[PDB]
């Protein structure tokens, strides 16, 4: 299992997100924003989003190195969510 | 922090 970029398209949304610059990391040394939880009955599940996916872009909004609140706001303001992620 | 979006 190594890294692979994917775009996931979602239609709450049953994902919890963790991490971000200046925030408690999700794992080891990484300050990225991650999918911490995926509830089996959400549009993100049928879109294929997976726990541990690192968020890179939400509808053009770049989240690489963004703070937590940035990702929260970007996600709520996005019907269609072209969600670019890095997955191991 | 975990937010449910």
Automatic annotation (TrEMBL), chain B:
Belongs to the influenza A viruses NS1 family. Homodimer. Interacts with host TRIM25 (via coiled coil); this interaction specifically inhibits TRIM25 multimerization and TRIM25-mediated RIGI CARD ubiquitination. Interacts with human EIF2AK2/PKR, CPSF4, IVNS1ABP and PABPN1. It comes from Influenza A virus (A/chicken/Hubei/327/2004(H5N1)). The gene is NS1. This is Non-structural protein 1. The dsRNA-binding region is required for suppression of RNA silencing. Transmembrane segments: none annotated. It comes from the Viruses. It is found in: Host nucleus; Host cytoplasm. Inhibits post-transcriptional processing of cellular pre-mRNA, by binding and inhibiting two cellular proteins that are required for the 3'-end processing of cellular pre-mRNAs: the 30 kDa cleavage and polyadenylation specificity factor/CPSF4 and the poly(A)-binding protein 2/PABPN1. In turn, unprocessed 3' end pre-mRNAs accumulate in the host nucleus and are no longer exported to the cytoplasm. Cellular protein synthesis is thereby shut off very early after virus infection.
């Amino acid at each position: 299992i190594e890294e692979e970029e994917l775009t996931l398209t979602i239609l709450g949304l049953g994902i919890s997100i963790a991490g971000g610059k200046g925030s408690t990391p999700y794992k080891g040394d990484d300050e990225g924003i991650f999918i911490s939880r995926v509830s089996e009955e959400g549009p993100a599940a049928r879109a294929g989003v997976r726990v541990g996916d690192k968020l890179l872009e939400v509808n053009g909004v770049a989240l690489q190195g963004a703070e937590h609140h940035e990702a929260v706001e970007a996600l709520r303001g996005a019907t269609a969510v072209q969600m670019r992620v890095w997955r191991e | 922090i975990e937010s449910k979006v």
